Ligand SMILES: CNc1ncnc2c(C)n[nH]c12
Ligand SMILES: [Cl-]
């Protein structure tokens with residue numbers, strides 16, 4: 001048995017990227033930036049955690065059909081940073097991450113996990129910074145960890 005992920009202090013978000021280059025840049029430099037509303041959501045979760053648990057980010061390129069890895073938020077959002085460092089000049093700010101898992105996990109492995117906070121929709125049909133309920137997040141993380 002693996003009862004590791006089966007922990008009450010942690011919050012988990014879906015991150016969608018239109019750009020594969022932005023994924024590569026995030027992995028190389030351990031940074032990210034979301035939309036205005038996404039940054040606001042992630043910053044609030046990180047700050048309210050107060051280091052009592054992780055904020056996990058489940059990354060997936062839009063249209064790719066798979067998740068590509070898992071990172072932990074590692075700083076609050078700095079909203080005043082160099083512009084234009086990502087593929088599109090649509091993002092304002094920066095925060096630190098730590099990629100802890102880089103591997104492709106097909107949507108077929110995850111699509112039976114549904115989000116009660118998003119109309120029972122499959123977790124694989126989420127938009128950027130959709131939050132995942134912790135009990136569903138534990139199921140997702142266990143599947144990502146054990147996929148081969
Ligand atoms: C740098 N951050 C990003 N890059 C490309 N796409 C997205 C989305 C949909 N949210 N944040 C994104
Ligand atoms: Cl699908």
Ligand SMILES: [Cl-]
Nearest residue numbers: 016126127128
């Ligand atoms: Cl999206």
